[PDB]
Amino acid sequence: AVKKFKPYTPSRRFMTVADFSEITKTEPEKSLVKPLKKTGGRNNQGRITVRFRGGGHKRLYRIIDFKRWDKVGIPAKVAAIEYDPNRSARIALLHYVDGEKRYIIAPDGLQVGQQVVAGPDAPIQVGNALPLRFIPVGTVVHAVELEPKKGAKLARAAGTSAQIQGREGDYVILRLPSGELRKVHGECYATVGAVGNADHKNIVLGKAGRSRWLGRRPHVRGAAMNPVDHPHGGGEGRAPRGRPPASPWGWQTKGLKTRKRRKPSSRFIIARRKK
């Protein structure tokens, strides 16, 4: 669910927060955290390369297992569910039977203390990892490697999940959260179920600073700039766009495809995103 407040300040009348209820432990696993180096958009030159960032609350990065084939056939117990301000999903605190601990993100439906395992012969049940040539066609999955051994790349945000459509040769076919149909590889692990916190998107920040706590600054309109700054800028009084709506760098921003043409991944992409 999601929690609302009363209009007891003008910004609460709308604001909404998660309920966390799936939360179990309120303290990260020291040995799994490490410093997250904030950037402010700027790069190895001090120049902003990602407009309008900086000033968000300080965070402490939870190292995550996007491999999980790192330990084949070593079951574990979901010790606790934690919260990672470094992503929209929830992390699962896994105590393997080796003794080693490490973090994953919470598939929807996990329960503290239940057991999970990775491996080809692993059971298809919300919380386990397998390749793709071994998962039942039609099962909703996530945390999908895009290629063998390169780590989970797909379906990693809240409610995100990819469903298996069919099989072809050494590859398999998935439906991405973007409606796209792509050939993935069978030897690329996944994790049954869908990601958690699916109530995320229904969130109303309610006021301006709450976007600052998130490190995302104010975003100005090209209409409010000047011609030296933005293509849309200037013009006495207000004004329409006077041209194909463009980015501050010149190029258009209303239906101009930029996915590189001669890109090999095409051969493995089928249905471009929908809607």
Partner 1 sequence: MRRYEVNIVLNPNLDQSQLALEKEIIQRALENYGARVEKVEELGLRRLAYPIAKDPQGYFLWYQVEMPEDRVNDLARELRIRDNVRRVMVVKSQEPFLAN
Partner RNA sequence: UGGGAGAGGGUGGUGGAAUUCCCGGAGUAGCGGUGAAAUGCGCAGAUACCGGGAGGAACGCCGAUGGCGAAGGCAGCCACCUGGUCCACCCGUGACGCUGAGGCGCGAAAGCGUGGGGAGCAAACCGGAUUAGAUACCCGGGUAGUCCACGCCCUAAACGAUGCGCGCUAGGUCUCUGGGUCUCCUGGGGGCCGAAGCUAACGCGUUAAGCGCGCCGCCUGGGGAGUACGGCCGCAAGGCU
Number of residues forming the site for partner 1 (CB under 8 A): 3
CB of 226 to RNA, least distance (A): 35
Distances (CA, A) of 26 to 11, 32, 114, 197: 27, 14, 19, 16
Here the tokens at position 15 are 């604001």
CB of 202 to RNA, least distance (A): 5
Residues 110-149 that bind partner 1 (CB under 8 A): 124, 136-137
The smaller minimum CB distance to partner 1, of residues 2 and 137, is found at 137
* 168 lines the binding site for partner 1 (CB under 8 A): no
Considering CB distances under 5 to 8 angstroms, the limit depending on partner class, which of RNA, Mg ion, partner 1, none binds residue 4? Answer: Mg ion
Considering CB distances under 5 to 8 angstroms, the limit depending on partner class, which of partner 1, Mg ion, RNA, none binds residue 136? Answer: partner 1
Q: Which residue carries 């030159």 as its tokens?
A: 45
CB of 190 to partner 1, least distance (A): 16
| Distance in angstroms (rounded) separating the CA atoms of residues 88 and 208 | 19
CB of 187 to RNA, least distance (A): 22
The smaller minimum CB distance to partner 1, of residues 139 and 178, is found at 139
Distances (CA, A) of 194 to 19, 39, 148, 157, 274: 19, 31, 21, 10, 20
What's the angle, vertex CA 143, arms to CA 138 and CA 103, rounded to 5? 135
CB of 185 to Mg ion, least distance (A): 9
Residues in the chain: 275
What's the angle, vertex CA 260, arms to CA 258 and CA 262, rounded to 5? 150
The footprint of Mg ion (CB under 5 A) covers 3-6, 10, 13-23, 36-37, 41-42, 46, 50-53, 56-57, 61, 200, 220-221, 231-232, 235, 237, 242, 265
The footprint of RNA (CB under 7 A) covers 163, 165-166, 201-202
Residue 169 near residue 98, CB atoms below 8 Å: no
CB of 206 to partner 1, least distance (A): 42
Count CB atoms within 10 A of the CB of residue 211: 16
Query: Using CB under 8 A as the criterion, which residues of the chain lie in contact with partner 1 when the complex forms?
Result: 124, 136-137
